[PDB]
Design a protein around this ligand. Sequence first.
Ligand SMILES: CCCCCCCCCCCCCCCCCC(=O)OC[C@H](CO[C@@H]1O[C@H](CO[C@H]2O[C@H](CO)[C@H](O)[C@H](O)[C@H]2O)[C@H](O)[C@H](O)[C@H]1O)OC(=O)CCCCCCCCCCCCCCCCC
Ligand code: CLA
Ligand code: CLA
Ligand code: CLA
Ligand SMILES: CCCCCCCCCCCCCCCCCC(=O)OC[C@H](CO[C@@H]1O[C@H](CO)[C@H](O)[C@H](O)[C@H]1O)OC(=O)CCCCCCCCCCCCCCCCC
Ligand SMILES: CC1=C(/C=C/C(C)=C/C=C/C(C)=C/C=C/C=C(C)/C=C/C=C(C)/C=C/C2=C(C)CCCC2(C)C)C(C)(C)CCC1
Ligand SMILES: CC1=C(/C=C/C(C)=C/C=C/C(C)=C/C=C/C=C(C)/C=C/C=C(C)/C=C/C2=C(C)CCCC2(C)C)C(C)(C)CCC1
Ligand SMILES: CC1=C(/C=C/C(C)=C/C=C/C(C)=C/C=C/C=C(C)/C=C/C=C(C)/C=C/C2=C(C)CCCC2(C)C)C(C)(C)CCC1
Ligand SMILES: CC1=C(/C=C/C(C)=C/C=C/C(C)=C/C=C/C=C(C)/C=C/C=C(C)/C=C/C2=C(C)CCCC2(C)C)C(C)(C)CCC1
Ligand SMILES: CC/C=C\C/C=C\C/C=C\CCCCCCCC(=O)O
Ligand code: OEX
Ligand SMILES: [Cl-]
Lengths: 342, 33, 34, 49, 60, 37, 38, 68, 188, 449, 30, 80
Amino acid sequence: KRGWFDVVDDWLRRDRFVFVGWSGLLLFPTAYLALGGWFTGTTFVTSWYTHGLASSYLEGCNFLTAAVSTPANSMGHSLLFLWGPEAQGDFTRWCQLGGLWTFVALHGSFSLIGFMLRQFEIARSVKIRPYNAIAFSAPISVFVSVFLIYPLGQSGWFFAPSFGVAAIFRFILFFQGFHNWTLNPFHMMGVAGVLGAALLCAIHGATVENTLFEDGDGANTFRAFNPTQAEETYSMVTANRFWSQIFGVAFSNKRWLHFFMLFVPVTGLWMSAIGVVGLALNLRAYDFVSQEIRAAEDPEFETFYTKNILLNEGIRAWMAAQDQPHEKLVFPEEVLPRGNAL
Amino acid sequence: MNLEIVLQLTALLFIVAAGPLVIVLLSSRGGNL
Amino acid sequence: MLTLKIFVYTVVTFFVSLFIFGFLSNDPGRNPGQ
Amino acid sequence: NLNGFNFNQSVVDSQGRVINTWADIINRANLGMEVMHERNAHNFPLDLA
Amino acid sequence: LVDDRLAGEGTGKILGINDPSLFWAITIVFTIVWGVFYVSTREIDAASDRENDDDFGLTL
Amino acid sequence: KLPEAYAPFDPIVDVLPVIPVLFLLLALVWQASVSFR
Amino acid sequence: GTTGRIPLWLVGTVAGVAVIALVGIFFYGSYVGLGSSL
Amino acid sequence: KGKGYGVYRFANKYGANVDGYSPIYTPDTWSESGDSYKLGTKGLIAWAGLIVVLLGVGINLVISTSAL
Amino acid sequence: AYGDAARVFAGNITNKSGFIPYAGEGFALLIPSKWNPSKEQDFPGVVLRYEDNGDAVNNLVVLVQKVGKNNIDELGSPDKFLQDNAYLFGESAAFTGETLSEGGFLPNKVAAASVLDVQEATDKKGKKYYKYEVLTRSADGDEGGRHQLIAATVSNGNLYLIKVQCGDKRWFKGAKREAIGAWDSFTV
Amino acid sequence: GRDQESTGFAWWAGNARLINLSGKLLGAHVAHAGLIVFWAGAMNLFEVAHFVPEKPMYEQGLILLPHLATLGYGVGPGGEVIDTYPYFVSGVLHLISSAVLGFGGVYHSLVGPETLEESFPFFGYVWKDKNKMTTILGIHLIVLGLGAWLLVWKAMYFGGIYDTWAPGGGDVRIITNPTVSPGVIFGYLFRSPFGGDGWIVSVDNMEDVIGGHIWIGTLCIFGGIWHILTKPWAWARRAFVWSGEAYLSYSLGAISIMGFTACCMAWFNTTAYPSEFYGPTGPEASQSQTFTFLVRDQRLGANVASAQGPTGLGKYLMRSPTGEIIFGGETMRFWDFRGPWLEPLRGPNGLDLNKLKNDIQPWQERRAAEYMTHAPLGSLNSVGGVATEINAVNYVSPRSWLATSHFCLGFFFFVGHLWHAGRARAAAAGFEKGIDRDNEPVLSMRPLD
Amino acid sequence: NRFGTIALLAVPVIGWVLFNILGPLQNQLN
Amino acid sequence: GATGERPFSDILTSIRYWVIHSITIPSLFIAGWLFVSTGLAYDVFGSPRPNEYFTEDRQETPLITDRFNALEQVKKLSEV
Ligand SMILES: CCCCCCCCCCCCCCCCCC(=O)OC[C@H](CO[C@@H]1O[C@H](CO[C@H]2O[C@H](CO)[C@H](O)[C@H](O)[C@H]2O)[C@H](O)[C@H](O)[C@H]1O)OC(=O)CCCCCCCCCCCCCCCCC
Ligand code: CLA
Ligand code: CLA
Ligand code: CLA
Ligand SMILES: CCCCCCCCCCCCCCCCCC(=O)OC[C@H](CO[C@@H]1O[C@H](CO)[C@H](O)[C@H](O)[C@H]1O)OC(=O)CCCCCCCCCCCCCCCCC
Ligand SMILES: CC1=C(/C=C/C(C)=C/C=C/C(C)=C/C=C/C=C(C)/C=C/C=C(C)/C=C/C2=C(C)CCCC2(C)C)C(C)(C)CCC1
Ligand SMILES: CC1=C(/C=C/C(C)=C/C=C/C(C)=C/C=C/C=C(C)/C=C/C=C(C)/C=C/C2=C(C)CCCC2(C)C)C(C)(C)CCC1
Ligand SMILES: CC1=C(/C=C/C(C)=C/C=C/C(C)=C/C=C/C=C(C)/C=C/C=C(C)/C=C/C2=C(C)CCCC2(C)C)C(C)(C)CCC1
Ligand SMILES: CC1=C(/C=C/C(C)=C/C=C/C(C)=C/C=C/C=C(C)/C=C/C=C(C)/C=C/C2=C(C)CCCC2(C)C)C(C)(C)CCC1
Ligand SMILES: CC/C=C\C/C=C\C/C=C\CCCCCCCC(=O)O
Ligand code: OEX
Ligand SMILES: [Cl-]
């Protein structure tokens, strides 16, 4: 190794406690900056001038109610650089205008890119297959569709999720009230995928741990294993028979088992991402026209779908005034939908 | 800094310090732990 | 309605008695251990 | 009836006025979906059940 | 009244018995199953190749 | 409230009930000092 | 000069006590001052 | 009762157990230095003086910058 | 920059009375601190309106109307004055129909007001006041009724009136203190 | 102590190293009992020192003091605390006895005999010796029966216990005629658990409680005597697993059932858990709200009986699905509630219209208003009211705390029973450490279809 | 001056660390 | 095995380590306390003090309406 590229590759791809690699140059700075931006925004920066709230520990918020807030709706889809035509180089006023959210999001996306690249590079250095790198595509797609594509199809960054706990809860409730997101088949596939992945994880762990082999004399079975051993540590035949007699069907292929384990959550997350991409343009599966027409013609027809519609209407009407200060909605108390005595 | 709060903190410190004191005393003198 | 109640009571007590007297019939001895 | 955390009107400024928060936005959404969950089943102001 | 009903819900009867026929059904079925089990419990024990002494049973 | 004769000992009472949790933590500390043999 | 080391269990005990005290201070500050609703 | 396997059945075939394969506490690899402080007693005395001074300065600064 | 240090180790609360004084054009009152300004003008002559952060039903409003009489008693008896200004509780003009299925309401009526207390008193200066306390109920019955506190007076040829509204649900839960404090502090 | 080298149990499962060590196990149990008594005494002292007389018991977050109030200690007519000295005495006695118990536990765990089967044959035992285990069970049954009789003696001769249904308001009565009728006792036991019936949670007078305690004391003493003099039969030897972990699993299941029952009793009962010291129950608050709104609207000149609601069912009074006159609204699901302040207005066919039209008392109205405002609703940070309220009230009902905590404990101990029953059944058979590679049971069976 | 106070606080920390670690650091550099 | 760095167990049980780090960690803690208490946190990141949420000019929540004059608008809204 004599060339500049060769010596740089020798140093970068070294055996170390923390592997740097060629992708480290993109991953470490951006990830560090994103983490620091989130911590700084949650600790010191406020949200009074862009949202009308308080979103910092300095103002009296706990871990749940502290967040990094989105810019105002007047800023549209501006990238809000520190040197842009809005902040104009002023750091304090850049923080006050909501520029830390775009900072964190833009650095986090490149950190995700760098992390997948790091997975690829480490897999190639160890001479294995890049299925772990393939599996990260689902989280990356979820992040891209939720934090970038959805706001890019709306009025501005104001309707993006804010980096916080209660902010994400408000985002979820808004998605329920306005989009009827629970009634979306793509979200249903995503929910099925997540719950099935949890089911698979629990059932595989229990089945492996309860079909072990007697390789020791102690009740603590964790010490009867050696990673370099040849024989398998549990009885696949016994597991298959148990699950065939209990459930009806069972796995007989370890490779197929583990590929299914990989396949389920990735597909669920990708389907949910497609659903959110569709929802970015207000293409929401909101209503059933036949049910609406039947309920309109017949004042006796009622199902749970109509009750959900009424709940969404109430959510919209009562959250609109404060959630969207730019619309300047002043609602007299007698126009808000309300039930009897409640 | 109320006097009652100072007394409560003193009592809490005395009670907490009584736990590892036994362990330290038995480990320093090579007791049967 | 009383006939349905009698029939259901008979069925339920039949199955529960089967369960009880089956688990009382030397159940711990039905294992492959040596 | 042991509900979750209630951080409503928790942040208060020097003169006593209320500074809102994401918890308060969530509370507004809850108020929206509360007065409509059963329209005609209530005769009295409190849903004690 | 317009129709008729059992009218027994929310009363507090022993095992829900309002008529002796339910008691008879329960007792008859339980006794039949118990007798069938009682005839065979001697043969079932002998499958363990051990006598039902004071040391019988699954012990550790 | 405690009787007037037991008033000076109120701060002692206010910290008593945490002792069982302290006992669990002390068991963990003893196991750590023994070095988890 | 000064031969000897510090017990790792002692280090762990002190660190645990420190973090527990920090969390307790955080909870106390949640019950009084800013963001205490009164 | 035990069957004579021990902690691991294939201890002779594979050399050792998982514990003997990837330990996380190896005093042999520890540095020869670090078990004795080179600066000795004078260094510890200087450290004690410095920590007392720094604690006093810190408490004074905390009290002064606050609202008493 | 500002240079102001944070109020660390401060044992005093700046405001703890729960009220914020207000100085207007010819009147003064103590507004609850938990309330926010509003941009609604429901009655003629609205010059001030505040509503609670947690519920928009709880609110106060101040009306300064032009009248010919220089004294409050020249507008009629307290009962007659309340009868003339009955629009302050709203009207059921949008409901045009006949019904007989209301709980404790007169036929074809979906709302009613119960005059719980009337009072006439003079301030320290020597200006007469008309004080009212009403409880208006609805056919559906939201909040379990609404409490209206009214204090009216005439000064310099203008009628000064304040109406404080508070839902019953909040009234018996401890929010009557703020409403009564705002009602009793109206000075002209 | 010991180590994994000579035991095979890791440090996180170290209490399993003293399964066959009788002396150390006894020391551990005695130390744990000392811990329980210590908590009881310390919590009683903490609650007695933070009690103000201007607020009711349920408004100050007390859970041990209402237990002593129901025994008639330091309470007066109507449910008002008068003296607070017996609570201090009880707390002091518990705290002092905890020291003796803890010393005994420490001695028996540290320097006492390790295995007391050779020096103390009377106290020594083997887990597989059925006769000795049955003898110990009988001894402890006798002790529990004596405890039940001790409770019975209090309500009869030593001043009695608080009765919330006593004529002229609740007061500390003396129970002279307990109900020892077999039909009454068997009616509570074999009752349905559904609504209206309520199983044993539906006991509505202190005479039934005292009679049932007489029954349970006699039964426990007789069963203890029976077990001391006998040994398990063939049908019992053929059905159970005989090991310490198996016995532990049985006890775990029993106490999980007990915890669930305690949760339900705290949530629903009003006799053994008077509302004067625990606050209103779930249904009680709703009934009180409807009652006070009916009273207020009647004072405003309205016809409550003939008033019609938005749905056409009745705003204040309607009919239960069996015919009884009940309160209207969503509180139509709580018509099984029966409380001391509401019973006097109830006739043979339900609520009496004339009685609530002309004979409603101010004390009843005050009780209804108080139980309406102090409803058992709250949040985790102790904020009273519904989830869409503000930060104004610091209150959570004592019934909610007990109910939630004991449901959690009951569920976790059911899970523990499952774990230990499975492990005992597997270990006794002999395959709790895994499958045998040489002789795998499945390889010897014919394949499925 | 407010930042100057923090810098002046941080100076002795750097001094102490340099005083305690200069030897082995120079050894590692060579 | 080991990648060529001092074991963490060896470092954390060293008199030198605990002599160096008996100064740095408390120094950083005091530095953060002084950063908050001296009012620097409010000024650097522009957060409102409890008395600066509402000014005598406006008693409502701030609202930014212009994208290119946003700097001047937020300068006007933050005026004390
Ligand atoms: C022998 C084996 C069993 C045989 C029978 C099995 C039947 C199974 C049917 C299938 C459905 C499952 C069971 C449903 C139970 C519903 C209980 C209920 O509606 O109510 C429960 C009742 C409460 O009864 C209430 O009792 C009340 C008492 O009345 C009176 O109570 C006081 C009396 O002074 C007051 O005066 C009060 O005002 C007055 O109303 C009222 O009657 C109520 O209407 C009545 O509902 O409690 C009780 O029976 C006491 C506690 C019961 C057990 C624990 C219940 C909770 C745990 C559930 C199971 C475990 C879950 C966790 C593990 C999950 C994984 C395995
Ligand atoms: C490691 C890689 C890295 C990457 C990929 C990013 C990425 C980004 N940063 Mg971050 N940043 C980093 C490290 C990095 N940063 C570091 C180390 C710091 C110092 C703390 C910052 C501080 C920072 C700030 C202060 C801001 C950003 C922001 C942004 C955006 C910049 C937009 C822009 O126009 O770029 C510049 C455009 C380019 C295309 C550059 C490439 C040009 C090539 C190399 C040609 C070179 C030719 C040129 C004519 C000759 C130069 C050579 C000669 C001078 C020697 C972008 C998302 C902004 C933000 O997020 O706004 C919301 C912003 O405000 N960053
Ligand atoms: C509920 C409380 C509790 C109790 C009573 C016990 C009881 C027991 N444990 Mg278990 N244990 C517990 C929880 C508990 N454990 C927990 C939570 C864990 C997980 C960390 C373990 C893990 C564990 C292990 C790994 C081992 C035991 C063993 C033992 C037994 C032997 C004691 C000994 O040799 O070392 C005692 C050691 C010391 C000398 C420390 C003394 C400190 C004293 C006892 C503190 C209490 C004093 C108090 C402050 C003042 C009382 C004095 C009085 C006058 C007031 C002892 C009976 C050992 C065993 O299996 O024996 C065969 C053993 O190997 N336990
Ligand atoms: C501390 C609790 C307790 C425990 C754990 C045991 C445990 C045991 N008992 Mg003992 N027993 C007790 C108290 C207890 N008993 C009391 C209080 C009495 C007096 C009634 C008896 C009388 C007794 C007899 C007569 C017999 C046992 C037997 C046994 C063994 C069989 C297990 C079994 O129950 O089968 C599992 C349970 C069943 C299949 C169903 C039982 C559920 C009953 C039928 C429910 C209805 C209750 C019943 C009709 C009683 C009337 C109710 C009441 C209001 C009067 C087991 C060792 C047997 C033995 O081996 O003796 C040596 C036996 O024949 N016990
Ligand atoms: C107690 C002996 C147990 C032996 C072993 C049993 C093993 C398990 C067997 C299966 C059990 C589950 C299925 C049961 C189905 C039949 C019962 C049924 O449906 O009844 C349903 C019926 C309902 O009866 C109704 O009654 C009404 C009037 O009240 C009307 O008459 C209705 O028409 C009638 O249907 O209820 C009963 O029969 C009452 C059962 C009471 C049982 C008391 C048990 C006391 C001893 C045990 C105490 C602890 C119990 C557990 C508590 C904690 C639980 C978390
Ligand atoms: C913004 C920005 C930037 C950056 C910065 C940075 C990078 C920073 C960082 C920062 C950081 C880096 C921070 C951190 C912080 C942290 C914290 C604050 C922590 C906390 C913690 C806690 C609180 C814990 C807790 C706990 C416990 C105790 C127990 C267990 C569990 C847990 C762990 C959770 C710059 C200048 C470049 C540029 C411009 C912009
Ligand atoms: C009543 C009374 C009393 C008594 C008391 C007592 C009895 C006490 C006890 C106490 C105790 C008994 C204590 C204890 C404590 C403990 C602790 C405090 C611990 C802690 C720990 C931690 C914090 C951590 C840990 C760890 C380790 C070590 C390892 C692993 C990891 C961790 C980190 C977890 C007295 C005398 C006062 C007198 C008066 C009265
Ligand atoms: C063995 C063991 C263990 C355990 C232990 C235990 C569990 C113990 C306990 C113990 C105990 C459980 C103890 C107790 C004690 C107590 C005491 C010591 C008390 C005292 C008291 C007093 C002193 C009082 C006083 C007073 C009075 C008289 C009146 C009022 C006021 C007052 C409160 C001041 C462990 C875990 C470590 C592990 C290892 C082994
Ligand atoms: C005090 C009182 C009273 C009374 C009470 C009583 C008298 C009770 C009794 C109770 C009883 C008397 C109970 C019993 C129970 C039982 C049980 C719970 C059983 C169980 C069993 C089992 C679980 C079994 C099993 C099995 C089978 C089935 C098969 C084979 C195997 C075995 C054996 C394992 C009253 C309520 C009046 C009132 C209030 C108070
Ligand atoms: C040969 C004589 C010997 C023993 C017979 C003794 C007693 C028989 C008693 C009763 C049998 C019928 C039981 C009926 C139970 C109640 C039924 C109901 O509630 O309707
Ligand atoms: O039903 Mn179903 O949801 Ca239980 O809360 Mn009340 O009621 Mn009705 O309302 Mn809300
Ligand atoms: Cl209702």
